[PDB]
């Protein structure tokens, strides 16, 4: 059992003594892993605390809390294998985006007015948690429409398909049914509009008060970005409000036409919704969000289960056809990813099962969409065999960035002799051990398994007498569990 | 050698493999003996006219070598084939009894067909076939030919062409009647006056006869040769009945919508020969799995479609497939399908498979009863939902594997955590709200192994955090305690010898 901790140690160890602290870190951050990761934490503490070279056994100190990751990293075996090649596509992508300079940043409010046009950031955070940016990724701007999928699947999680979709639809509008509000059964066509926005926002947390709602979302959103950066700009907050006239005339008609959970102070609701709409990231932040609806729910950085699977697909599912305010039929056709676009200018993008990604440039089209982000899209996904509905086979000149020893006990455990010739054939050790120091044998002997013991001993030829860790041999596994036969053909062999 | 290698694969022992060992073999992937790509090992087969040894399995599958390695190796799309199929039944069994829908009776050929003909066929990017039910008996097509011409006419004429002649986009259920958009063009080649203007795109300068044989040839080449037919019955009916659709011809002539020099009544000629157009389950299937397969058809490796064509039609039919229905079905079953009259709904599991099943009558939408049944449960089941996660999918099964997330649960995550101590690792998963008594084969926790260990922070967090079962007894009855007390780890000991009672 050569250590996981050595065994990475010659990884990066070409050949010398000692590694110097630096080597190990561009290394790592080869990777794509961030030092500031909360998942290495325990290392870069002991890292500091060797306070520069570090031989097999210092090393094998630093990295040995956070063994696992690092196996999972140096292995090269994350979803973006070799992530230094798929970053400078991506600064590709984003440098030729950045020659785009048409689009009219929003003015209907000073604070969305405030901000350059020249501001422009991707950011990129895969499933495992690879992280990337380029441009202006740190500098916080609100949510906006943004935040439609994320108070939706918020809901869903809370309360399920059925409940949710009693009070909006699942549909894309089609052409102008927007100005129709109302569907055939008088609901929101789905929740990215701004009359599904709102009714979505009347189902979260009912029962109690606007500030406790406000703070079960934000709990929320923080979890799934991983602890990074989420804000409130109560500033933007007050001038949504005072220009939100319009979407009170939308409450007012939903409150008549009972679109709301029957007894819902209206004017409360609003007050949330644009609460909501003012909420701050960066693209870091919800590039993180983004690669937790990527990642099935599960939040890359720290693991935790934050949507149910449900919640997610319906999340994703909509925002591939409603998300892009009038251009997502068409973005659904060319990109087909499941983005979402908001007025400060961010774009929300999924890849599912790759990378979340963020990506933030003021000035909008003629539909409300980032110009520079939209132009990036198209770009990605001509670039890598990204779409939908491209194949993982035959992808043309597109670019795709992307058995364990318990595999053998556990065939030796249901006594399945086919799986194990196939191993056997596949030229996989037959005598590894587990971390009990148990082998094929061992469990086929406690199972009295004869066909499989005959088949170890006799093919593959394996050495009868291994020792557990509690120094037990398969014959001594025979004779404990009753199995004599078996534990007469290994006595055979003394 | 692979042709050793898998002779000792199939000979399960037995130093010399009978002929029906290695057909049933076979069978056992899904992979047919009709199999195009196995012709030469089939053929050396049969001179069983002029038992197998080393020598002789070498010379038959020597020229099939590639395909039958990769099919015995278990590297196929679905590697547990026999199971996934007894699924497949199981749903089939339970959409049988889903007895409503009409027969289409406006017209006498389709209303000929009993309301209890129902059929599955599956055939996966690999080649793996399966079949339940009346799937070798001849339909048409219908609108399940959409998707087939509008990909034969972008394989040939590329996106931007395609597309200054029908836009790409549904209508919306409230102008499921408006015929054109505000581009003045159809929404999108699934409805009828997007269908009647992309047949017109089809080889244009050659006349209708040819025009019939270069569809035909290329429907063939999507179904590896399997068969299509033609029903003249249904087609002359569709001819005469078919009176909305000159209305909607001439209309979209008045409006320009065709290409310069179009003769309209010519295309809706052609238009009800290709909805005349017949297939059975099992060959729709292969037709369909070309689509799930990125142009390729799997059972002869032929390039057929170009990328583009077939990305195209599969979002299309995603969004537009399945009638006033679309929305919903792209809600739920998250499949790119395309329905029809008789029927047929062609299915699309993108990587997969792809997949046709067939039963006459019609909900009030126009979509088989007994295939929408079908899909919904298929979702249900397994995690093909296109916006599915193919890491965290919850209680669906991934026929793409095999039946080891507990190797994978154990295969690392709890016992190898626990193994080298990897405390941050097992916080994560208690985060992830995974079963952290997950058992090995030799019941073993990842409590046992940390305290065998003596790792005292990882038996804390499982303790005191996670709260994990204080006392299992492993294969051979020692609690974790006894593991400390054997090798040590006072401490280890002494943390547990609370728990004790
Ligand atoms: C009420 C509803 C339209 C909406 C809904 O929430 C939902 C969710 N999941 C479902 C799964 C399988 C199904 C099979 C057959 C008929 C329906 C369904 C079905 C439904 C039906």
């Not at 500031?36 to 630093?62: G, Q, W």
Request: hydrophobic share 40%.
């Amino acid at each position: 059992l050569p250590s996981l901790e050595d065994l990475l140690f010659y990884t990066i160890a070409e050949g010398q003594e000692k590694i110097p602290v630096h080597k190990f870190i561009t290394a790592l951050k080869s990777t794509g892993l961030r030092t500031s990761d909360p998942r290495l934490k325990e290392c870069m503490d002991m890292l500091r605390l060797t306070l520069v070279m570090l031989d097999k056994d210092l090393f094998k100190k630093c990295v040995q809390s956070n063994i696992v990751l690092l196996t999972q990293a140096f292995r090269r075996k994350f979803v973006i294998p070799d992530f230094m090649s798929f970053t400078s596509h991506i600064d590709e992508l984003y440098e030729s985006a950045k020659k785009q300079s048409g689009g009219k940043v929003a003015d209907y409010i000073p604070q969305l007015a405030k901000f350059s046009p020249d501001l422009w950031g991707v950011s990129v955070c895969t499933v495992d948690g690879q992280r990337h940016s380029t441009g202006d990724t740190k500098v916080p701007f609100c949510l906006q429409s943004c935040v439609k999928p994320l108070k939706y699947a918020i809901a869903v999680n809370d309360l399920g398909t059925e409940y949710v979709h009693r009070y909006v639809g699942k549909e894309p509008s089609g052409l102008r049914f927007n100005k129709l509000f109302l569907n055939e059964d008088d609901k929101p066509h789905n929740p990215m509009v701004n009359a599904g926005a709102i009714v979505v926002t009347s189902l979260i947390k009912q029962g109690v008060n606007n500030a406790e709602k406000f703070d079960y979302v934000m709990q929320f959103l923080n979890k799934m970005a991983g602890n990074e950066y989420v804000g409130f700009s109560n500033a933007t907050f007050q001038s949504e409000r005072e220009s939100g006239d319009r979407n009170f005339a939308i409450g007012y008609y939903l409150k008549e036409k009972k679109c709301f959970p029957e007894g819902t102070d209206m004017v409360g609701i609003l007050d949330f919704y644009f609460q909501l709409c003012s909420i701050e990231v960066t693209c870091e932040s919800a590039s993180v969000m983004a690669a937790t609806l990527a990642n099935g729910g599960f939040c890359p950085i720290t693991g935790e289960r934050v949507l149910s699977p449900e919640a997610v697909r319906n999340t994703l599912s909509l925002m591939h056809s409603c998300g892009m305010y009038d251009f997502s039929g068409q973005f659904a056709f060319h990109v087909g990813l499941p983005a979402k676009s908001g007025v400060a200018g961010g774009i929300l993008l999924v890849v599912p099962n790759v990378m979340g990604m963020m990506c933030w440039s003021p000035p909008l089209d003629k539909m409300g969409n980032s110009v520079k982000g939209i132009h990036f899209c198209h770009d990605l996904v001509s670039l890598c065999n990204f779409h939908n509905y491209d194949n993982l086979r035959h992808f043309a000149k597109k670019l795709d960035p992307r058995k364990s020893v318990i595999n053998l006990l556990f065939a030796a455990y249901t006594g399945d002799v086919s799986a194990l010739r196939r191993f056997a054939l596949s030229a996989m050790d037959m005598e590894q051990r587990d971390y009990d120091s148990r082998t094929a044998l061992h469990v086929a002997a406690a199972e009295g398994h004869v066909e499989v013991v005959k088949f170890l001993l006799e093919a593959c030829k394996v050495n009868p007498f291994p020792k557990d860790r509690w120094n037990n041999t398969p014959m001594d596994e025979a004779l404990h569990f009753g199995h004599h036969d078996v534990f007469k053909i290994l006595q055979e062999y003394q």
